[model samples]
Target: YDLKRLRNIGIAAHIDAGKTTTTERILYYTGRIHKRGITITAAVTTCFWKDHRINIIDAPGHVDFTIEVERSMRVLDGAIVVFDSSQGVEPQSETVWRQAEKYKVPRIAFANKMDKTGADLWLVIRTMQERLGARPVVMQLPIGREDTFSGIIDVLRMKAYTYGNDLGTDIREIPIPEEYLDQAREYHEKLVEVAADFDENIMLKYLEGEEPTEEELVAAIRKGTIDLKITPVFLGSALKNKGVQLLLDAVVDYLPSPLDIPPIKGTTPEGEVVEIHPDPNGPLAALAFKIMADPYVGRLTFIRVYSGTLTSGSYVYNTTKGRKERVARLLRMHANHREEVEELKAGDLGAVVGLKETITGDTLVGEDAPRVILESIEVPEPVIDVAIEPSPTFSVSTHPETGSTIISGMGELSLEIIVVGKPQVAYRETITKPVDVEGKFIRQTGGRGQYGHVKIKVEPLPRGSGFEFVNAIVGGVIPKEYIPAVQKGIEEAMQSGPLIGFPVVDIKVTLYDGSYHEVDSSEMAFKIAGSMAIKEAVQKGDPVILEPIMRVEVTTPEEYMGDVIGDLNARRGQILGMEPRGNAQVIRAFVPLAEMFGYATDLRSKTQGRGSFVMFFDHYQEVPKQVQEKLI
Candidate 1:
C-alpha cells in the first residue's frame, strides 16, 4: 500500500544453508501463499509485513549457478547473507560476501542451523568478524545447544524467546537465567559498543556513561546499517522453523527501504548524468534484471521500477535497444502462478509478459525523459569450472532429440564433477622460441596442377593472450583474399597440438610471404599449405606442453594441515599461503588439474573425511619434461 515502506531484498548463501526453506516460511507467514507453488531458476517471492511488501529473491548456492546470485544482487536493495552454523563461513559464503561488497549492498547475517550438533554459536559469530571482516553485532544468543536447542536470548532486550508450534505470535520475554546472566551482560556491552559508534548522539551518550533506551538503540543500529558499515547478525535453525518470524521482524525494522537509499544515478546516451528519484509521479525508468522463458508466456522479464509508475497498455522506450516496446501485460508473480495486473509503482518488482528484444540489464523508460543507464548486472565469467571442454570421442551415446552427449567419468574429480570417464587433461602446446618455416603444396594430377607456397613465423605470446594472426605481407606476396585461407589453416593446425594431440593456445602466427598459382591455386590449397607451414614452424619453435593450473582452497582440521601441504608438494603444487578459519585451517595452493583430478577419494582417506576442497582453473603453466612424458 505504501511505496516508501517497500523493501527489495535477496536471500543468498551457500547451497543447503536453508535459504530456500527460510524463504518458503517467510512466504507462508506473510500469507503470500496459501496452497502449492511452482518454478524458476532464480525465484522471486514477495512477503508483506504490516503494510510494507518485501520482495525476496532466493538465489541458489551452488557455485555453478553462482551467476544466478550475481544477477539477483544487481537489482536488490538489501540482502540476507546466510551462513551455516556448523560450517561457519564456507567457500560460497565468501564468494557471495565479496559480491555484496562489490555492489556495496547493505546486508545482515543469519547464522542458520543452530540446532545441529557441534553448533558453536560463539565460533560462528567470531568467524563473521575474522573471516568476513564484518562487525557482527550478535542480536541474540541461543537458549540451548544441539538437540536441546530451544530458543534465543535476545541480547539487546536481555530476554528469552522460547519456541512453540505457533512460530510465537508474541515473543514472551523471560528474565535472563542465572547461568547466562553474566555472559548476556558481556555480549550486551559489546553490542552497545559497536552500535553506538554509528550515531553521533548515541556515541556521546555512551562516552558519558549514560545508557540509551531500546528505541534509541534500534534507531542507532538502523542508522549504522544504512551506510553498510555494520552487519546485524541473527541466529536460527530454519529447519526447526524456530526463529524465522523474528528474522522477518528484524528485516522490516533494520533493512533499508527505497526511500532510505540514495538517488539512483544514470547517464544519458549523450553523456549527461541524471538522478532518478523513487517517486511514482516521476518519469518512468525501470531495470530489467532477469529474463525467464516461461512455458505459458513467450518470455517474462522481471524488472524493478526505480522511478515513476509503469502501467499496462503504455509504450515505454527500450532505451537499451533504442526502440519502443508496447506494454503487453504486467504480472504479479507468486512462484509459478501469476496474475495479470495493470500497474507497478517505484520500488515494486514484477514481470512483464511481452518483451521481445529486452534482455537482462536493459533499461526501459518513458519517452521525453532524461536519459540514464543504470548499472548493468554483470554475470560472473565461468573461467573456474575445471576448464574442461566437451569431447566427442569420450561421449558414449548422444541424446536423440537434444543431441546431447552422454559421457561419464570415474573418480570424484573427473567423473563426478566435469564429465564422463577419464577426461583427457586439457594440455596445450605453445612455442618457447620463434621459428620460420616454409611449406609448398604442388600436385600434378592431370591437365591442371595445384601449387601453393607459404612462409609462416610462429612464436609464443604471454599467458592468456590467446591467439593472433598477422598479415605482414608486402607487395601482396599472396593475394589478400588468400590471407583468410592461410589464417584458417593455421587455426586448423592449432586444433590438434602436435605434442599430445590437445589444442594449441597462447601463440601468435604470422604470414609474411607466400606464392600462389593463378591457374591452379585455390583457397583449399592455400589453407593446406599454411597449415603445413605452421606445423613445421611449431616443431622447430621448441614447443612445450602447457597444462591447466588450478588455484585450490582446502579447509581441514589442524591435524591434517601439515600432511595436506606435503601431499600437495609431492603433486607439483605450489603453496601460496595459509589462514586460520574457525577451528580449521585454510590451505591455498596452485596445482595442475591433472594432479588434482583423482584427489577427492585420496583426501578423504588421509583427513578422516573432515577435509574439503574446491578449485578453479587459474592459468596454464609448462609441465616439467619428465612429468609431461609420464602423464602420457
Candidate 2:
C-alpha cells in the first residue's frame, strides 16, 4: 500500500467541545456508516471507523484522562484539535495544546458548536492565537450565528455552502454571500500573506505584483502546517452537520501523512544509534503505544507500524520486554467497533489482542534485529489519598457495600487514595551534638567463637540525599565481602527507627574501623555488629520527625477565596500565590498531607459545586513541636 494514501489522524479537544460528534459526521460522509447523526453519549458506537484501515484515534479531552491524550499524540500522524465556539479556550485546551506541541503534532483547528447560543467564531480564533501560540488562518467562515446558523464561506475557493433544515441535502456551492464577501476577501488576503511567507517562490511572485496560482498557495500552506508554522482554522456546527465535509477535505489536503513525516530515531540495546524510516520493505518495527483492558475482549494493544509489514499469526519479538509474541489477530478500531485484517503495513495503526506481556511504548520487530526502546508517556502523580480496607460484611440489603472501606468509614476509592496511603514516612535522625557509640558481637559459648567489633561515625547528610553508607576500611581492617553485609544490616535497621517506628532518611553512616575473627568472621556476625552500632548511635542523635509536604492548586469562585484561605491557614498551609482563571480563582499553596486527609469532601461542602483542587508531593519538612506532640 502507498503510504501517501493513508491518513492517520485523531480528534482532540477540551471536554464537551463536539469532537465526537464531528468524528461521527466524518464517518457518515465517508460512507463508513449509514447514520447521518450520532450522539457522543450513545455508548461509544460509530467510533469503529478508526479500526477499518485509515487509522484514527479519538482521544478524551478531560484533564483526568490526559495520559490517554498524550499517548494519542505520540502515535497519530496528525490531529483535529476542536474547541467550543462559545467557550473558546478552557483549561483543558491549554493542556492538550501543550501536549501537542511537546510531541510536535501537526494539527488543524475545528471551531465547533457554532449553532449553539453565544457561539462566536472570532473569539475561538483569538483564544487559539493567544493561549496556544497558534497563528490560525481562516479556511472557512460561518454565514450566520446561533439559532439562524446556515452555512459557511470557503475563503480559498471563494464559495459558499448552505444547509437546509435537514442537513442531508446535496451540498450546493454558490458565489460568496454579498454580506460576507468583504470580510471573506480580507481573510483570504491574510491567508495568502501567511502562505507566501512560507515559500520563497511565492514571496517573490507576490513582491513582483503577480498573484501566485492556487496550487502554489495550497502547497505553501501544507508545508507551513506540517512545520507547525501556521494553524488552519475551520468553522462549523458538528451538531447541525454544517461544513464538516469541507473540514475533512482540508485535513487530507493540508495535514501530513506518515510518509511525509521524518524518520524516528532511537538508540539500540547495544548502545548504537539507529533510524527507522517509513519503509514497508524494511524490517518490521511497530510501536505499541496504548493498552486497554476490555472486560469482554480481555486486553487490546494499539500499535503504530513505523516500518515493514506485520502479518496475522506471525511471531514478533517484543524488544522492550525481551519476549516473543504470536500475532493472534490484527484489528482496525473505530471507537468500539472492530474489523479483522490479515496484515498491517508501515504507516498504519492497528490493534491486537491476547498478548499478556505486551505493554505501552514497546517496540515489536524481528527477532534478529537490534532492540529499540522508545520513551513512554509521563503521567501526573495522584494528589489526595485515603486509607481503605475490604468490608467484610454489609448490613443493608438495599445498598450493599462492594469495594474496600476506607479507615474513615468510606467505601470505594480512586488511584489517588492508593498512592497517598502507600507513601513511605520520611524521618531524619541527626546528632544535635556528636556522641560516640560502640557495638561488639561476642559469643564464647558457641562451637566457633563469634567476635565482631565496629566503630561508626554518624552524621547528617544533605536534605533528600537519603541514606549513605561509606566504608573507609583501609589496610584490610574489614574484609571487602563483609562490607556489603554491614551496609545491608544498617539499611534493614533504619526501616524501624530507634526512637520511633518510622523509617530513617538523610543520614550518613561511616565504618572507619572494625575487627573480625579470621575463622569465625561471617556476614551474619558483621551484620549484627553494624545493626547494633547504628541503633545505639540513633538514640543519642536527637531524632526528630519530618513530615511530607504537598504542593496544591485549588480552583474556586471568588466568593469562596477568603474562606478557603482561612481554612488553609488554620491547617498550617503556606499560601504561595493566587491568580484569576476565567470566572474562578486559582490558589497555590504548600501543606502537609497529614492535614489533607478529607480535603476533597471538605472543599466540596464549602464551595457547593464550584470548587476543585489538585495536589502533588513536594518535599519533607520538620514537623512543628505542637503538631509532633499530637501525632506522637
Candidate 3:
C-alpha cells in the first residue's frame, strides 16, 4: 500500500449532531463496501474511496464517553468535526474540539443539517472561530437552506455540485449560480489570502491581483490545512442526501495523510529516544486503542499501525505490558463484520486477535528491535453515578460488559438506559475530630488467657484524603508478627463507622505503643484489640455520614432556565455558570447525587422534552442534617 494514499480521519461532534449518518453516507456514495457497516456510535473501521483507503473512527457526542473521542483523536492524522447547524457551537463540540487540538490533529469542519429549520451556516462558521478558537475557512456554502438544500458550491473551483435524491450519489458539477457568484468569490478570496500566508509563491501571485488556478489554490490550501492554520468548513444535510460528495473530496484534497505530519515520537523501554517515520520498512509501532469483549472473536484489540508491517501469526513485543504477543490473526472490519487478513502494514487500522496481554494504551512493537513506547491516552474521571433501581416497567437483566444489571425503560422511553448510582442503603462513615484510646483484649478459659494491648490515635484528615495508617511504635512494642493483626483490625473497624454503620474514610490512624503477653498475644488477640480501639475512637471522634456529589451539564431552553435553576438549587446544587448553546443554554452545576436520582423525569416534564443533561461522579461531601436524620 502507498503511504501517501492513506487518510486516517475521525468524525467528532456533540450528541445528536448526526455524526453516524455522515460517516455512513461517505462510505456508501464513495464506492466502498456495498452492504454498509454498523452506525459508528463508538468504534473505528476502514473504508475505500477511489485509489485510497480511509480509516474512519466514529466518535460519540456525550461527555460520558469522552475516552472514546479522546483516544481516537490521539491516533488520528485529522478529524471532521461535525456540528448541528441548528445548534451551532455546542458544549460537546467545544469539549471534543479542544481535545483534538490537544492532540495536534488538524481538522475539517462539516456544518451538517443544512436542511433543518434555523440552520445558520455562517453563524456556525463563526461560532467555530469564536467559541472554539478554531480558524474556519468556508470551502463550500449551502445552495439553499432547509427544504431547498439540494447541493453545495465548491469555492475553490468556483463550481456548483447538485445532487439528486438517490442518497447523494448522483452529483452534477455545473457553473456557479449567478445569485451565489458574488458571495462565493468573496469567501474564495478570503481563502486565498489565508492560504497565501503559508506559501510565498501563492502570496506573490495572490497579492499581484492575479487569480489563482484551482491546482495552485488547492496546493496552498493543503499546506495550510496540514499545518492546521485553518479549518475548511463544508456544508450538507445527511438526512436529505445533499452535498456529501464534495465533503469526501475535501477529505482527500485538504486533509493530511500519515506521511504529512511529523514523525511519531516514542521512547525505548529504558526511556531513551525513538522516533518512527511512516515507513513500513521501519521498526513496528502500533497502538492498541481499545479492547472490546466479543463473544465469538474473544479479546478483539483495535490497533493503529504507525511505522511497520506485520504478517499473520507474527510475533511482537508489548512495551506497555512487558511481554511478547503473537498476531494470531489480523482482521479487516466492516463495523461488526469481520474478515481475516494475512498482513497489516503501516498507516493502516485493523484488529488483532490472540493478543490477550494487549489492552488499551499498550504499545505493540517489533520483538527483534529495541522496544518503543508511545504515550498513553488519558480517560477523564467520572463525575456522576445514578443509582439505578429496577426500571418501573421493564424486564431487567445483567450485562457483563457494563458490569451491572440494566433495564430498557419499556417501549417509547427505552434509551438503553443503565443506572449506576448509590446503593439501596448508601452510607459513608467518617470522624469529625480526633480521639486517642487504649484497647485491651483478654480471653480466659481453663487452658490459658489471650492478652493484647494497643494505644492508637484517630484523627480526621481533609475531606477527600481517604484513609492513612502509620506505625509509631517504640522499643519492643507491637512486634512485626502482631503488627499485621493490628492493622487488619483497624481496616475492619474503618469499614463500618460507629455512629450509623457506614464505611469510614478521610481519616488517619496511628499505632503508638502496646504491651502484649508473649504467649497469649496472638494475631487474633491483637486483631480484636485493634478493632475495638477504632470503634471506640470513632465514637469519641464525632462520626458523621458522607454522601456522593456529581458534576452536571444541563441543556435547556431559555424559557425553562429559571425553573431548572430553581429545581437544581432545591436539590442542593451549586450553580457554576451557563453558556449559550444554539437557541438553548448549557448550565453547569455541582449537585448532591442523592437529590438527582429521579431528576431526568422531572427535568423532561418541566421543559417539555426540550431539555437534556449528562452528569458524572465528582466528589463526596458531608450529608446534610435534614437528610442525615431522615435516613436514620
Candidate 4:
C-alpha cells in the first residue's frame, strides 16, 4: 500500500458520547464490516475510502480505560474526536482532548448524536472554543434541527448531503436546500475566510471577490488540520446514519495520512538521535502500543509499523526492553476478527500473534536493526480502588491493614463488571505537627554487636507535597553508605500509618543527628532504626487520616439544580460554583470519595435520570473528626 494512502486514525470521545456507534457507522459505511457496537478493549479495524486504507482504532470512552485512548493516540497519525451534540464538552471530553493534544495527534471533531433532543451544534462549537481552547472551523452545517436533522450541508463544497433511509448507505448529494441556503452560505464564507490563513491563493482570490475552488479549499483545510492550526468540525447522528459518508470523505480530505506525519524520532543505544521515515525498504521500526491475551492466538501485540517491513515467522528485536521476539504470524484485525497476513509494511497497523515478551510501548525493529527507542505512551494513574473477593482483571494490590484484596482501576465502571463488594476510598495519613524523635537499635551483650542511633525532626508539608528526606548529618555522624538505609527505613515506615495503615504522605523527615557503630552498624540496622524512628515520630506528630477528595462536575437540567445541590451538600461536599450551560446547570464541587459511594444511583433518582456527572482525584484533605472515628 502507498504510504500516502494509509491512515491510522483513532475514534475517541467522552462517556456515552456515541464513540462506539460512530466507529461502527464508519466501518459500516466504508463497507469494511457489516455491524458494530459496544467495545471493551481498543478494537482495531481497517476500512477503505476512495481507495485509501483507514485503520481505525476504537478507543474506550470510560475514564478507567483511557489507557486505551492514550496508547491509541500515541500510535495514531490522526483522529476523529467525537462529542455528544447535546452534551457539549463533558468531563471525559476534556480528558480525551488533552490526551490527543499530548501526543500531538492532528484530529477532526465530530459532534455526534445531532438527532438527539436538545442537540445544539452551536453550543458544541462554543464549548469546543471555550473549554478546549481549540480553533474549530465548522466544515459542515446541520441542514435540519434536532430529530429532524436529516442532512448536512458541506461548507467547503457548498452541497447538501441527505439520507432518506436511516441506513448509512442511503446518502445522496444535492444542492443546498432553499431554507438552509443562507446559513450554509454564511458557514461556507466563514470556512473560506479561515482557510485563507493557510493558503495565500484563497486569500488573494477572496480579496478579489472570488471564491476558492473546492480543491483549493480542501487543501487549505487539510494543511491547517495537519499543522494542528484548525480542527474541522463535522456534525451528524451516528445512530441515525446521517452525514456519515461525508464524514468519511472529510477524514480522507482533511485528516493526515502516514506521509503527512513528520519522521518518527527515536534514540539509539549509543545516545544518538535518529529519524525514521516511513519506507518499507528502510530498517524496520515499529511500536507495540497494545498487548492483549487472546484465547485463540495466545498473545497478540498490536504494533504500528513506522519505517520498515515486518514479515511473518521472522525475528524482531524489542528495543524498549532489549529482547528478541519471534513474529509468529501477522494478523490484520477487524474488531475481534483476524486475517492472517504474510507481511506488514511501514505505515501499517497489525497485530503479531506470537510475541511472548513484547508489551505495550515496546519498540520493535528487524534483526540487526538499529536499536532505537521511540517515546512510549503516557499512562494515567487509576484514581479509585475497590475491595473485592470475586474480581475481574485489572492491577491488584492488597489492603495493608484489612488483608482484603483491593483492585484499583481507572473509575467505577472499569471495576463495576466484577465488583460484588464495597468501594474502598484510597486514603492517606499525614501529620499535622512536627516532632523530634530517636530510634536506637543496640545489642552490646556480645562481640560484633549491633548499634545504630538516629534522631530526626518530622514536619508536616502541604497537602500533596509527598514525602521528603533531608539529610543534615555532618562529620560522618552517619556514614554515607548507611544514610540511604535510614532513608529507606523511613520510607518503609511511611507505608503504613499508625492510625489505620494507610500510606503516609506530605511530611518531611530531617536527619539531624545519629550515631553508628563502625563495624556492627550495618545498613539493615540503620534501616530498622530509621523505620522505627519515623513510626514513633508520626505517633507524636499528631497524625491524622486523609481521604481522597474529588473535583466533581454535575450537569443537569435547571429544574434539578436545587435537589442536586442539596444532595451534594449532604455528601460532605463543598460547592465551588455553578453556571448555566445551554439549558443545563453545571455544578462544580469538591467531595470526599468516601461519601461519594453510590452517588450515581442517588443523583439519577434525584434528577429523574436527567443528570450526569464526572469526577477525578483532585487532592487529599484531612478527614473530619466524625468520619475519622468511623474509619478507625
TM-score for all models, in order of appearance? 0.69, 0.69, 0.72, 0.67
lDDT tens readout by residue for model 1, 184-235 = 9898888888777876777777789877788888887888888877888888
Q: Highest TM-score, which number?
A: 3
Clashing pairs in 1: 408-420, 408-421, 409-415, 409-420, 409-421
Clashes of 2: 9
TM-score of predicted structure 1: 0.69
The global Cα lDDT (0 to 1) of model 3 is 0.76
Candidate 2: pairs in clash = 47-334, 47-335, 48-334, 49-334, 50-333, 50-334, 51-332, 51-333, 51-334
Each prediction's total of clashing residue pairs, residues at least 3 apart in sequence or on different chains, is 5, 9, 8, 0
**RMSD list, candidates in order:** 7.1, 9.5, 7.8, 9.0
lDDT scores of the candidates, listed in order: 0.75, 0.72, 0.76, 0.80
Cα TM-score of candidate 3: 0.72
Which of the two candidates, 3 or 4, achieves a greater lDDT against the reference? 4
Pairing residues by index, what is the TM-score of model 4? 0.67
User: Model 3, 319: alpha-carbon shift in Å?
Assistant: 1.7
lDDT of 4 by residue, 548-581 (tens): 7888888776777899999999999999999775
What CA RMSD would candidate 3 show?
7.8
